[PDB]
Coordinates of all heavy atoms in Angstrom, one line a residue:
Chain D
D5 N 34.4 -32.2 18.1 CA 35.1 -31.0 18.5 C 36.1 -30.6 17.5 O 36.2 -29.4 17.2 CB 35.7 -31.2 19.8 CG 34.6 -31.6 20.8 OD1 33.7 -30.7 21.1 OD2 34.6 -32.8 21.3
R123 N 26.7 -15.5 18.3 CA 27.1 -16.2 19.5 C 28.6 -16.3 19.7 O 29.2 -16.0 20.7 CB 26.5 -17.6 19.4 CG 26.7 -18.4 20.8 CD 25.9 -17.8 21.9 NE 26.8 -17.0 22.6 CZ 26.4 -16.4 23.7 NH1 25.3 -16.6 24.3 NH2 27.3 -15.5 24.4
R128 N 24.3 -9.4 20.7 CA 23.0 -9.9 20.8 C 22.5 -10.2 19.4 O 22.9 -9.6 18.3 CB 22.1 -8.7 21.5 CG 22.6 -8.2 22.7 CD 22.1 -6.8 22.8 NE 21.0 -6.7 23.8 CZ 20.0 -5.9 23.7 NH1 20.0 -5.0 22.7 NH2 19.0 -5.7 24.5
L151 N -0.2 -22.7 -2.1 CA -0.7 -23.9 -1.3 C -2.2 -23.7 -1.0 O -2.8 -24.7 -0.9 CB 0.1 -24.1 -0.1 CG 1.4 -24.9 -0.2 CD1 2.3 -24.9 1.0 CD2 1.3 -26.2 -0.9
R283 N -10.1 -11.9 0.8 CA -9.7 -10.5 0.4 C -10.4 -9.5 1.2 O -11.5 -9.7 1.7 CB -10.0 -10.4 -1.1 CG -9.5 -11.5 -2.0 CD -10.4 -11.6 -3.3 NE -9.8 -12.6 -4.2 CZ -10.4 -13.2 -5.2 NH1 -11.7 -12.9 -5.4 NH2 -9.6 -14.0 -5.8
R315 N -9.2 -8.5 -15.2 CA -9.5 -9.9 -15.2 C -9.8 -10.4 -16.6 O -9.4 -11.4 -17.1 CB -10.5 -10.2 -14.1 CG -10.3 -9.9 -12.7 CD -11.2 -10.6 -11.8 NE -12.6 -10.1 -11.8 CZ -13.0 -9.1 -11.0 NH1 -12.2 -8.4 -10.2 NH2 -14.3 -8.8 -11.1
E326 N -7.2 -22.9 -18.5 CA -8.7 -22.9 -18.3 C -9.4 -22.9 -19.6 O -10.6 -23.1 -19.6 CB -9.0 -21.6 -17.5 CG -8.5 -21.7 -16.0 CD -9.5 -22.3 -15.1 OE1 -10.5 -22.9 -15.6 OE2 -9.3 -22.2 -14.0
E333 N -17.5 -9.6 -28.0 CA -18.7 -8.9 -27.6 C -18.9 -8.9 -26.1 O -19.7 -8.1 -25.5 CB -19.9 -9.6 -28.3 CG -20.3 -11.0 -28.0 CD -21.2 -11.6 -28.9 OE1 -20.9 -11.7 -30.1 OE2 -22.4 -11.7 -28.4
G338 N -15.0 0.6 -22.1 CA -15.7 1.9 -22.2 C -15.9 2.4 -23.6 O -15.7 1.6 -24.6
Chain F
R223 N 26.4 -32.9 27.3 CA 26.6 -32.1 26.1 C 25.3 -31.5 25.8 O 25.3 -30.3 25.4 CB 27.2 -33.0 25.0 CG 28.6 -33.5 25.1 CD 29.5 -32.3 25.0 NE 30.8 -32.6 24.4 CZ 31.3 -32.4 23.2 NH1 30.6 -31.6 22.4 NH2 32.5 -32.8 22.9
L323 N -12.6 -11.2 3.7 CA -12.0 -11.0 5.1 C -13.1 -10.2 6.0 O -13.2 -10.6 7.2 CB -10.7 -10.0 5.0 CG -10.0 -9.9 6.3 CD1 -9.6 -11.2 6.9 CD2 -8.6 -9.2 6.0
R356 N -20.5 -21.9 -18.8 CA -19.2 -22.1 -18.2 C -19.2 -21.6 -16.9 O -19.7 -20.5 -16.5 CB -18.3 -21.1 -19.2 CG -16.8 -21.1 -18.7 CD -16.2 -22.4 -19.0 NE -14.8 -22.5 -18.2 CZ -13.6 -22.5 -18.8 NH1 -13.5 -22.4 -20.0 NH2 -12.6 -22.7 -18.0
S364 N -16.4 -11.7 -10.3 CA -17.4 -11.6 -11.4 C -17.0 -12.4 -12.5 O -15.8 -12.5 -12.8 CB -17.7 -10.1 -11.8 OG -16.6 -9.5 -12.3
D379 N -23.8 -16.0 -25.5 CA -23.2 -15.3 -24.4 C -24.2 -14.2 -24.1 O -25.2 -13.8 -24.8 CB -21.9 -14.8 -24.6 CG -21.7 -13.8 -25.8 OD1 -22.6 -12.9 -26.2 OD2 -20.7 -14.0 -26.5
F382 N -21.5 -7.7 -23.7 CA -21.2 -6.3 -23.0 C -21.6 -5.2 -24.1 O -22.7 -4.5 -24.0 CB -19.8 -6.2 -22.6 CG -19.6 -5.1 -21.6 CD1 -19.5 -5.4 -20.2 CD2 -19.3 -3.9 -22.2 CE1 -19.2 -4.4 -19.4 CE2 -19.1 -2.7 -21.2 CZ -19.0 -3.0 -19.9
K388 N -22.8 -11.1 -31.9 CA -23.2 -12.3 -32.7 C -23.9 -13.4 -32.0 O -24.8 -14.0 -32.6 CB -21.9 -12.9 -33.4 CG -21.0 -11.9 -34.1 CD -21.8 -11.3 -35.3 CE -21.3 -9.9 -35.7 NZ -22.1 -9.1 -36.5
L473 N 19.4 -18.9 24.2 CA 20.8 -19.0 23.8 C 21.7 -17.8 24.2 O 22.9 -17.9 24.1 CB 21.0 -19.5 22.5 CG 20.2 -20.7 22.3 CD1 20.2 -20.9 20.7 CD2 21.0 -22.0 22.9
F478 N 21.6 -10.5 27.0 CA 20.1 -9.9 26.8 C 20.2 -8.5 27.1 O 19.7 -7.5 26.4 CB 19.1 -10.6 27.8 CG 17.8 -10.0 27.6 CD1 17.0 -10.1 26.4 CD2 17.3 -9.2 28.6 CE1 15.7 -9.7 26.3 CE2 15.9 -8.8 28.5 CZ 15.1 -8.9 27.3

Side-chain angles (χ1 to χ4, degrees):
Chain D
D5 299 293
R123 185 65 270 188
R128 304 155 106 214
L151 281 175
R283 306 156 176 160
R315 299 197 291 270
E326 298 272 8
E333 64 192 70
Chain F
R223 287 292 208 116
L323 188 51
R356 180 72 199 251
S364 62
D379 58 42
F382 197 102
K388 307 295 152 198
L473 301 169
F478 180 69

